[PDB]
Amino acid sequence: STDPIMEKLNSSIAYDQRLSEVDIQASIAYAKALEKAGILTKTELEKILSGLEKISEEWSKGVFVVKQSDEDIHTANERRLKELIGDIAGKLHTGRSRNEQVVTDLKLFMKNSLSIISTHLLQLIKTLVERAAIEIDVILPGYTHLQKAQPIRWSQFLLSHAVALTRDSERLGEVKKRINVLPLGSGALAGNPLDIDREMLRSELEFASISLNSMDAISERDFVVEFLSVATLLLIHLSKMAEDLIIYSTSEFGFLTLSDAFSTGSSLMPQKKNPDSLELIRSKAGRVFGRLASILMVLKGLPSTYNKDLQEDKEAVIDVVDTLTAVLQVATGVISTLQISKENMEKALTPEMLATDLALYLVRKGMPFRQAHTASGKAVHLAETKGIAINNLTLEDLKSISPLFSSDVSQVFNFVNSVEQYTALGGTAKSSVTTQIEQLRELMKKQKE
Amino acid sequence: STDPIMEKLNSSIAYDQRLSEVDIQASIAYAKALEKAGILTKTELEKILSGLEKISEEWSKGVFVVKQSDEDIHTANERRLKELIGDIAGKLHTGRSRNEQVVTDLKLFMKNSLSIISTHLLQLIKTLVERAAIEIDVILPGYTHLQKAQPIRWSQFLLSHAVALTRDSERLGEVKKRINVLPLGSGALAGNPLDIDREMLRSELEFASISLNSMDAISERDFVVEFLSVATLLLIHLSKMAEDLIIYSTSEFGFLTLSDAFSTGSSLMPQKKNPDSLELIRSKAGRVFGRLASILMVLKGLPSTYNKDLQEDKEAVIDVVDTLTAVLQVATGVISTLQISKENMEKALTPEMLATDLALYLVRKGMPFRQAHTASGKAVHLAETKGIAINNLTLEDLKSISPLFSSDVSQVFNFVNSVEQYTALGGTAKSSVTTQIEQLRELMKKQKE
Amino acid sequence: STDPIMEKLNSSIAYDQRLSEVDIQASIAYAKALEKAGILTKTELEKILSGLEKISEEWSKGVFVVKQSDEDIHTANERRLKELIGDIAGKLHTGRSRNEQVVTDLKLFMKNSLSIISTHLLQLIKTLVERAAIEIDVILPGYTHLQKAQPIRWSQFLLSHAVALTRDSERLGEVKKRINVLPLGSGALAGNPLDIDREMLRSELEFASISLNSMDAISERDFVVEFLSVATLLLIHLSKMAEDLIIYSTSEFGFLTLSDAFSTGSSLMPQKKNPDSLELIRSKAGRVFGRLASILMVLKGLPSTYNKDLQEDKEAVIDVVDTLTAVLQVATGVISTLQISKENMEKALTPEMLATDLALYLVRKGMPFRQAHTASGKAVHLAETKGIAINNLTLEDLKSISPLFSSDVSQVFNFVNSVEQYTALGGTAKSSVTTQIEQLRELMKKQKE
Amino acid sequence: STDPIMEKLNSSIAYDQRLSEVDIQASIAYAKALEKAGILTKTELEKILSGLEKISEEWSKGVFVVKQSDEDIHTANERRLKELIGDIAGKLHTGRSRNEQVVTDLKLFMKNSLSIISTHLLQLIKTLVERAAIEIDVILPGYTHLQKAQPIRWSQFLLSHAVALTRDSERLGEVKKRINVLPLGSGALAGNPLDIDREMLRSELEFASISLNSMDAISERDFVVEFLSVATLLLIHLSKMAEDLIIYSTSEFGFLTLSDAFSTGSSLMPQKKNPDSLELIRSKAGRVFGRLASILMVLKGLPSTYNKDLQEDKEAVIDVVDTLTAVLQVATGVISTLQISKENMEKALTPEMLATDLALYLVRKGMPFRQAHTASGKAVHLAETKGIAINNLTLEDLKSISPLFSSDVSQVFNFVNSVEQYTALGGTAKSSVTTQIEQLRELMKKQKE
Ligand SMILES: [Cl-]
Ligand SMILES: [Cl-]
Ligand SMILES: [Cl-]
Ligand SMILES: [Cl-]
Ligand SMILES: [Cl-]
Ligand SMILES: [Cl-]
Ligand SMILES: [Cl-]
Ligand SMILES: [Cl-]
Ligand SMILES: [Cl-]
Ligand SMILES: [Cl-]
Ligand SMILES: [Cl-]
Ligand SMILES: [Cl-]
């Protein structure tokens, strides 16, 4: 009777086959609770768990056969169990609703997915932290407005990304905690009428706790929005790092080149070596953001309790989980195999970036910063008008700006001296970077457990 | 050499196989232009067109074989042609870039897709217009704030949706016009170096014109954003109609019930008959919006010219084209097979909705509207305090509010009289509705051609 | 020199005057650290803190005078201090960047704002929890697909919203923790060169800790995205509750009416009483979501470190903070003053919603659920074809469906009996609702501290 | 009675004062139609138009006084007219609803706003087209993946942006057409009951036509979504151009520097000259996108007809109209006053970008492209391994790759020769660029009228 086109638009089995195992696992747990509730005889339970375990095997062996009438994974497994053991299968449905199987399964899938994602995320952070430890002596320009600002260590750069990524890791753990709440036993919205043992369900399925209200457990998708939100910000961080590496990979900047494994050429232009890995990653930010936008829209203005609209969550979660997994591993390969050009990073170190240091120089000699700033500004301009860099002005030139300049300004013109000024926690001085590295190694240790 | 994970993240063949035919068609057109440009001998052209036509057959017969190395459809067809005719295949690549094949193919796919979508959209509008013509005598409540406002014809309701949908149709035609501009011959960004005959390409591929600048033709995706944008607004309209029908389908409202073909029951609650068709449609608004959001993000801040980030467009377009096709046809089935309850729509017609008419009554007798409004307000409240509807107050009751009320107020209390006040173009009077119906039939006639 | 139009587009003083106080407070803290770093003499510090305190007074008395050249609050306060104490003011700028003042100020503003928001959020949850305790005996329909499902307690409904809102409260606390990290002392990106005492800054400004990397502290806006994200989900929850109350406020449903303080009439239609409060709230979901979308877009693909693009964060945060504050308080008024119609909620309780209970009845007598479900389905249909409700079928009618039905089915037809089946934790049975109420009172107690 | 906080959240006068004039203008038009409908005496009309004209003066002189009770502009003007002429003012409300004043006013405001925006947009395109005509001999690198691709003319670059901006202009005109439809006379939803002369209203207010259905005219906001959508894509284009100019403004690229009027320095780093104008513009893309996202969300799932949720449209439209106006003018200043470095653009022209030309060279001599591509690839690599550019390999070196290379390959190594290959329409050859310039001058001529 169902209109074929609507039935097709209604089918979620194509993607939600990814929930085949957690669905059996959840059915198994419920079968045991039903036996304890007196709905199944221990003899029936056996037939049921045996059938379910068999269906699990069919899916893992890639031999399960999806039929036309299967509008979703839940309907598939129920059909299969019935054709295996008959009428007994039908007892498993007692007090159970699809509205609760759907969030229970997706949460089970998400818990497993987060572990994998976490593992990869931590490996990415580690890769950045460990390379930062190895390349701690490298100094290059730091930018604001994409204009050379003040010199910083390449390790300080790798660590800013590592640090941001660590907050992503942290948010990921917080979301996992609310994901880890058992919704099974909420029924279609009013709860379970059998005095089902929810605690037994909880430990069996390995959730940290149970849902507090049946109407909310079945209507909410905060856990989907949260996931999508944190994943989006994680992607945002990756788009910024991509933007950085792609620009630094240009021939104009020349700071680095990715490995051949993470680049591709051009079937038309023979000279090309393109940073595809990073561009792909940068574009995924939009992809994941679209998933977040869609779910927020799907939810807005919907009435309590369950609504068929909610079915759009599955595909969005699965797609973002797969994007993360791929994106994180690729990012790792890139960071660990890319080749920096210590020579070019060094050449890019030009005197004008030391203009702030030149002003502090005068400040140390007594001049108030505002004046010191304008004086340093003049030297920058004098050198420009003269067609040279500031370190090439003469001492009398500096005196023409302020007699406060003494022969010892020569010490201002030393990049190692520049970065080494920033010892206060968080700065780019080498001792601060080593401190950060240690802090991050600890943070990771704690994130892992 | 390419990292396997990055290569997988980079593959677009899974979805872009949908472009198999337009890609051959575009290669065929270019092969003929290359022969005219002196790159191919008429003998070579023959081998080439014959090979291409053969590959086209493989795809349509569902026998084409995708190999590991095929990162996209373009790479697949090029590989296949080479293994069919050898070295000659390689001449087809002359002066051609993937950056141009990609937008040429997607535009070719979009042109064909729009025709199908248009056909369905027009059928949906027709369905609403024709039912509105049949059910023109039905009157029910009209709402603002979901509170009963003034009575309107059910046909006036069906037509508001038809009208909005017609603007969707119109926007769809405008987008098609800019989609219909040939980008082939832009190369990787600098244009074509062979003095290729772009006009020949244009007519051959059936585009209305050619791109003006090669750098823009290869960098832009306005045609994707536009499509996604209009599709999103179209979905918005459908979410509002869905919201309406779902609410009207409630037992509390009781105005209508969808057919069984567009509903489904509940495996747990035996009494349920749910309007799945409409909820599915309403949720797609979010889905399509997410696609729009993702592409806008993918594009923002990207430098000229082509960037690998752009590859995310394919899957978003294909997904939205398929959503539209399904959603439009389902919407049509729903509107044409749903059953209204003329009796309940009639029962819902209550006197308080005529309070505005009661104020105009006094206005006709000389009272300024502001005063007429407060007087009518009092009658509404008097009736409430008295526990009756306003048409049940006595004439002396109305006189206690304003002596201006005469025995002829009885004429105010007639719903057919209410709606029939709105004869000015656009209103709910029957003559206005018939006018609208005629206007829409014409609009559709013009949209179709 | 600056183009007047660009300067206007660049000015953020209109909105960022809201940061006038935290900016002084942050300048005060830095002045004291500069004295300890040897940049200011204790005599200079005095003049500085005295001047700053004076500027603080000007803003709080609403007498501060913004001049043309003030492109932001930071520039305003610096100008004012200089015209008050002269050259000494300029020493305060030593080692300080706008890039760090900007995030330090906004975080200070956000910390204060979250406290207010939290206070209001907790009051909203309390309002729902306490009313749920008072109206615990009320039963009405529960819905899925906006179709009557199974009976539930009105208190179970109020609590689903309370529960969701509690997760919003929890997420709000997590975000506050990362907001509470001091970024001051990061300079323009390389850190602070004076060995400034960041710990002194931390305790002085009351942050829980300090930023780990100067490049990240100045480039990131995770704290803005997080805030916007959680606020958006909070709004989503409020849009669903609004959708519920507006629908329940219809005359068709008739379950409740809001108070006059939270409604408005119509200048045209005298009978109208509209639920403006709820519609306003529902629409804010979109408003806040737009703010989230904008910031995510502003950030995507931006290079390290600071970029002027980031300046868009201020107005988005301030607007959402003000929306939350207003929305939360209004929501509270609505819930606490609305009037339910116990009589209509009772009348809406119809027999078909007990069809699931009727199937369990047969299940208890031995029949497998699948069969019990179809049997109950038949009774629903028999009653329909007969034009009566199911509780009106005769016992022999039920026997015609299944001889398993005995005279005691009469017990199935009792709504208090229906809801009382759900005693398992989370359900709608009265003992479960009282449990929830207790749990939520505790949760709130912990959230508050 | 209205809760003060809800009343504040409900007030739209702060921003919708921008609609003060179009609101009077719309009231004036309706007053004249009411007189013709027999509701006002010609004597009353006079008092009314005189009062309205007076209120118009108050607003334009900046002396109108907003009172507490004014929840919107419509309520303000109605109050003011009443206190000026008394009871007569109240007759103007006859048959009129706020639901129609609101869309009529906003459309009137949008029509005027589009004209201004169009004027500025066309000036921006002109600025790019005319500079492209002046700097037509300049050649620099063209990029894909931000990697040097093939040489192109700077004019070809300016024109790709001009061309995209022209589509923005075109879409803007299409939106204006649907904006130009008169909604006045739709009442609260059922239409107008006075047989009001809508055609008279149309010409009087200068709309191109009238709305077809009263229910749609009052419920829709397609005209807002459309506007926001096109404005967003326009901003997208501007974010890409900004991304380009900011990168080209780097010292690493060194192709250009903006004028001082469109840059700003750093209060901390004396050497800085930052491209604020472009970064501000790039960030507005997100701002405008957020406005689009919010309105789409506000609309999704809302029931017919009017809902208070719709009130969020005003502020979004006004904000985007003001952003466009500022952004467009600033963009113009930037393009017209920026200074390119013809010398550096020339230096950036390196031999590897000619590798495609080198392959075509062999193709002309008979070699199939695929082979020609790999041969050219080898030369690129040989030169790398040798530490020189390809134009420095010896003829015998090229022979070692393919004996097909003859002394005349020297002609391949000429950049003017490179770009001049692209004469086919749209390419970067000089004759193609002059063609584009002419086409765009015409397009603008037509857009203007
Ligand atoms: Cl047993
Ligand atoms: Cl090196
Ligand atoms: Cl000296
Ligand atoms: Cl020939
Ligand atoms: Cl009927
Ligand atoms: Cl009389
Ligand atoms: Cl001292
Ligand atoms: Cl009552
Ligand atoms: Cl019996
Ligand atoms: Cl007269
Ligand atoms: Cl020059
Ligand atoms: Cl030779």
**How far is it, in rounded angstroms, from Cα B183 to Cα B110?**
14
SS (H, E, C) B99-154: HHHHHHHHHHHHHHHHHHHHHHHHHHHHHHHHHHHHCCCCEEEEEECCEEEEEEEH
**How far is it, in rounded angstroms, from Cα C356 to Cα C140?**
16
Structure determined via:
X-ray
**How far is it, in rounded angstroms, from Cα C182 to Cα C216?**
12
CA dihedral D399, D404, D405, D408 (to 10 degrees): 150
DSSP A302: P
Please check whether residue A212 is in contact with residue A97, taking contact to mean a CB–CB distance below 8 angstroms: no
Structural domain contains residue B2: no
């320095």: which residue's tokens?
D265
Structural domain contains residue B86: yes
**How far is it, in rounded angstroms, from Cα D1 to Cα A252?**
68
**How far is it, in rounded angstroms, from Cα A104 to Cα A127?**
35
Of the residues C164, C196, C219, the one at which a domain ends? C219
For D383-406, give the DSSP string: HHHHTS-GGGS-HHHHHHH-TT--
Q: Measuring CA to CA, which residue among C283, C267, C274 is closest to residue C251? A: C274
Please check whether residue B249 is in contact with residue A277, taking contact to mean a CB–CB distance below 8 angstroms: no
Please check whether residue D140 is in contact with residue D160, taking contact to mean a CB–CB distance below 8 angstroms: no
């620099």: which residue's tokens?
D140
Those residues with Cβ within 8 angstroms of residue C346's Cβ, 6 or more apart along the chain or in another chain: C139, C140
C113 with C261, same domain? yes
Stretch (H or E) spanning C111? helix C98-134
Please check whether residue D166 is in contact with residue D125, taking contact to mean a CB–CB distance below 8 angstroms: yes
- Can you read off the two tokens belonging to residue A142? 């730091």
User: Residue B412: how many CB atoms within 10 A of its CB?
Assistant: 22
Structural domain contains residue A6: no
B311 with B289, same domain? yes
Q: Do C279 and B145 touch (CB under 8 A)?
A: yes
Q: Do D145 and A358 touch (CB under 8 A)?
A: no
Those residues with Cβ within 8 angstroms of residue A273's Cβ, 6 or more apart along the chain or in another chain: A257, A260, A263, A265, D147
For residue A381, CA distances in Å to A72, A149, A385, C175, D252 come to: 71, 16, 6, 45, 20
Sign of the alpha-carbon torsion through C50, C52, C56, C57: positive
Please check whether residue A305 is in contact with residue A219, taking contact to mean a CB–CB distance below 8 angstroms: yes
Please check whether residue A99 is in contact with residue A186, taking contact to mean a CB–CB distance below 8 angstroms: yes
Q: Measuring CA to CA, which residue among B421, B308, B306 is closest to residue B357? A: B421
Biggest CA–CA distance in chain B, Å, is 101
> Hey, what amino acid is at B260?
D
> Hey, what amino acid is at D105?
D
A414 sits in the region (left: phi over 0; alpha: psi -120 to 50; else beta) called: beta
C264 with C160, same domain? yes
B174 with B207, same domain? no
Enumerate the residues of chain B whose CB falls inside 8 A of the CB of residue D363: 39, 94
Looking at chain B, which residue has its C-alpha nearest residue D44? B368
> Hey, what amino acid is at C222?
D
D385 with D429, same domain? no
Q: What are the beta bridge partners of residue B274? A: B264
A248 with A259, same domain? yes
From the list B98, B269, B280, which residue is nearest A188 (CB)?
A: B269
Stretch (H or E) spanning B293? helix B276-299
Q: What is the whole-number distance in angstroms between the Cα of residue A382 and the centre of ligand 3?
A: 21
Cα-based angle C320, C322, C327 (whole degrees, multiple of 5): 90
C403: CATH = 1.10.40.30
Those residues with Cβ within 8 angstroms of residue A308's Cβ, 6 or more apart along the chain or in another chain: B274, B276, B279, B280, B283, C145
Please check whether residue C391 is in contact with residue C413, taking contact to mean a CB–CB distance below 8 angstroms: yes
DSSP A325: H
**How far is it, in rounded angstroms, from Cα A385 to Cα D366?**
55
Q: What are the beta bridge partners of residue B141? A: B151
Sign of the alpha-carbon torsion through C113, C114, C115, C117: positive
For residue C218, CA distances in Å to A233, A436, B148, C102 come to: 17, 16, 54, 9
C259 with C339, same domain? yes
How many contacts does A have with D, using Cβ atoms within 8 A?
124
**How far is it, in rounded angstroms, from Cα C28 to Cα A283?**
43
Please check whether residue B137 is in contact with residue D182, taking contact to mean a CB–CB distance below 8 angstroms: no
The per-type count for chain C, helices as H runs and strands as E runs, is 17, 6
From the list D5, D97, D294, which residue is nearest C330 (CB)?
A: D5
Structural domain contains residue C2: no
Please check whether residue C433 is in contact with residue C156, taking contact to mean a CB–CB distance below 8 angstroms: yes
For C134-157, give the DSSP string: HTTT-EEEEEETTEEEEEEEHHHH
For residue D403, CA distances in Å to D357, D373, D385 come to: 17, 15, 21
3-state secondary structure of D210: strand
- Can you read off the two tokens belonging to residue B101? 């094949």
Catalytic option among B145, B251, B267, B407: B145
Please check whether residue A31 is in contact with residue A40, taking contact to mean a CB–CB distance below 8 angstroms: yes
- State yes or no: is C118 an active-site residue: no
Looking at chain D, which residue has its C-alpha nearest residue B222? D233
Q: What are the beta bridge partners of residue B144? A: B147
B253 with B309, same domain? yes
Stretch (H or E) spanning B318? helix B313-337
Those residues with Cβ within 8 angstroms of residue B331's Cβ, 6 or more apart along the chain or in another chain: B124, B238, B241, B281
Please check whether residue D197 is in contact with residue D39, taking contact to mean a CB–CB distance below 8 angstroms: no
- On the 0-12 / 13-18 / 19+ scale of CB atoms within 10 A, D413 is middle
**How far is it, in rounded angstroms, from Cα D308 to Cα C349?**
31
- Can you read off the two tokens belonging to residue B229? 């944008």
**How far is it, in rounded angstroms, from Cα B25 to Cα B14?**
20
**How far is it, in rounded angstroms, from Cα D409 to Cα D419?**
16
Stretch (H or E) spanning D257? strand D256-257
Q: Measuring CA to CA, which residue among D110, D109, D80 is closest to residue D92? A: D80
Structural domain contains residue A2: no
Angle between helices B98-134 and B73-85 (to 10 degrees): 120
- On the 0-12 / 13-18 / 19+ scale of CB atoms within 10 A, A376 is buried
A219 sits in the region (left: phi over 0; alpha: psi -120 to 50; else beta) called: alpha
Q: What are the beta bridge partners of residue A209? A: A181
- On the 0-12 / 13-18 / 19+ scale of CB atoms within 10 A, C389 is middle
**How far is it, in rounded angstroms, from Cα B271 to Cα C374?**
10
> Hey, what amino acid is at C446?
K
Is the link from the previous residue into A305 a cis peptide, with omega within 30 of 0?
Answer: yes
DSSP A251: T
Please check whether residue B313 is in contact with residue B292, taking contact to mean a CB–CB distance below 8 angstroms: no
Those residues with Cβ within 8 angstroms of residue B162's Cβ, 6 or more apart along the chain or in another chain: B125, B128, B129, B132, B440
User: Residue A349: how many CB atoms within 10 A of its CB?
Assistant: 16
Q: What is the whole-number distance in angstroms between the Cα of residue D40 and the centre of ligand 10?
A: 8
Angle between helices D154-179 and D430-448 (to 10 degrees): 20
């994901």: which residue's tokens?
A179
DSSP B274: B
Q: What share of chain A is helix, strand, coil (3-state, %, to 5)?
A: 70, 5, 25
Q: How many structural domains compose chain A?
A: 3
**How far is it, in rounded angstroms, from Cα B92 to Cα B79?**
12
3-state secondary structure of D287: helix
Q: Do A373 and D274 touch (CB under 8 A)?
A: no
Angle between helices A73-85 and A42-60 (to 10 degrees): 120
Q: Which residues of A are catalytic?
A: 145, 266
3-state secondary structure of C129: helix
What beta strand segments (E) does B183-302 contain?
Answer: 209-210, 256-257
Q: What is the whole-number distance in angstroms between the Cα of residue D315 and the centre of ligand 3?
A: 62
Full residue range of the structural domain in which residue C329 is found: 109-179+220-349+422-448
Q: What are the beta bridge partners of residue B181? A: B209
Enumerate the residues of chain C whose CB falls inside 8 A of the CB of residue D291: 290, 294
Structural domain contains residue A7: no
Q: What are the beta bridge partners of residue A151? A: A141
From the list A95, A191, A368, which residue is nearest C91 (CB)?
A: A368
What beta strand segments (E) does B124-255 contain?
Answer: 139-144, 147-153, 181-182, 209-210
- State yes or no: is B373 an active-site residue: no
B251 with B356, same domain? no
From the list A277, A290, A297, which residue is nearest B294 (CB)?
A: A290
Sign of the alpha-carbon torsion through C41, C46, C47, C49: positive
SS (H, E, C) A345-372: HHHCCCHHHHHHHHHHHHHHCCCCHHHH
**How far is it, in rounded angstroms, from Cα D55 to Cα C201?**
56
3-state secondary structure of A420: coil
Give the ranges where A300-429 is alpha helix by DSSP (H): 313-337, 342-347, 355-364, 369-386, 395-401, 415-419
Is the link from the previous residue into C305 a cis peptide, with omega within 30 of 0?
Answer: yes
> Hey, what amino acid is at C288?
V
3-state secondary structure of D153: strand
């939350």: which residue's tokens?
C324
B227 with B319, same domain? yes
Please check whether residue D303 is in contact with residue D96, taking contact to mean a CB–CB distance below 8 angstroms: no
- Can you read off the two tokens belonging to residue A329? 């591993």
Q: What is the CA radius of gyration of chain C?
A: 30
Q: Measuring CA to CA, which residue among C394, C366, C367, C365 is closest to residue C382? A: C394
Please check whether residue C176 is in contact with residue C114, taking contact to mean a CB–CB distance below 8 angstroms: yes
**How far is it, in rounded angstroms, from Cα C147 to Cα B264?**
12
Q: What is the resolution of this structure in A?
A: 2.2
For residue B17, CA distances in Å to B24, B63, B66, D17 come to: 11, 12, 10, 54
Structural domain contains residue D410: yes
**How far is it, in rounded angstroms, from Cα A93 to Cα A78?**
9
Backbone angles phi, psi at C362, to 5 degrees: -65, -35
B123 with B258, same domain? yes
Structural domain contains residue D385: yes
Give the ranges where D37-153 is alpha helix by DSSP (H): 42-60, 73-85, 98-134
**How far is it, in rounded angstroms, from Cα D150 to Cα D351?**
10
For an interface test with C, give the residue of A220, A305, A443 to mutate (most C CBs within 10 A).
Answer: A305
- Can you read off the two tokens belonging to residue B41? 């001998």
- Can you read off the two tokens belonging to residue A301? 């203005």
């006036």: which residue's tokens?
B156
Angle between helices B222-248 and D154-179 (to 10 degrees): 30
Q: Do A191 and C429 touch (CB under 8 A)?
A: yes
**How far is it, in rounded angstroms, from Cα C351 to Cα C337?**
31
Q: Taking chain A, what is the end-to-end CA distance rounded to the nearest angstrom?
A: 53
Enumerate the residues of chain B whose CB falls inside 8 A of the CB of residue C274: 144-145, 147
How many contacts does A have with B, using Cβ atoms within 8 A?
172
**How far is it, in rounded angstroms, from Cα B214 to Cα D429?**
11
- Can you read off the two tokens belonging to residue C270? 């005298």
User: Residue B279: how many CB atoms within 10 A of its CB?
Assistant: 22
C147: CATH = 1.20.200.10
Those residues with Cβ within 8 angstroms of residue C388's Cβ, 6 or more apart along the chain or in another chain: none
Those residues with Cβ within 8 angstroms of residue A408's Cβ, 6 or more apart along the chain or in another chain: none
3-state secondary structure of D221: coil
Those residues with Cβ within 8 angstroms of residue D163's Cβ, 6 or more apart along the chain or in another chain: B212, B213, B216, D436, D440
C250 with C147, same domain? yes
3-state secondary structure of D28: helix
> Hey, what amino acid is at D219?
S
Biggest CA–CA distance in chain C, Å, is 101
**How far is it, in rounded angstroms, from Cα C95 to Cα C196?**
9
Please check whether residue C191 is in contact with residue C100, taking contact to mean a CB–CB distance below 8 angstroms: no
- Can you read off the two tokens belonging to residue D139? 């050649």
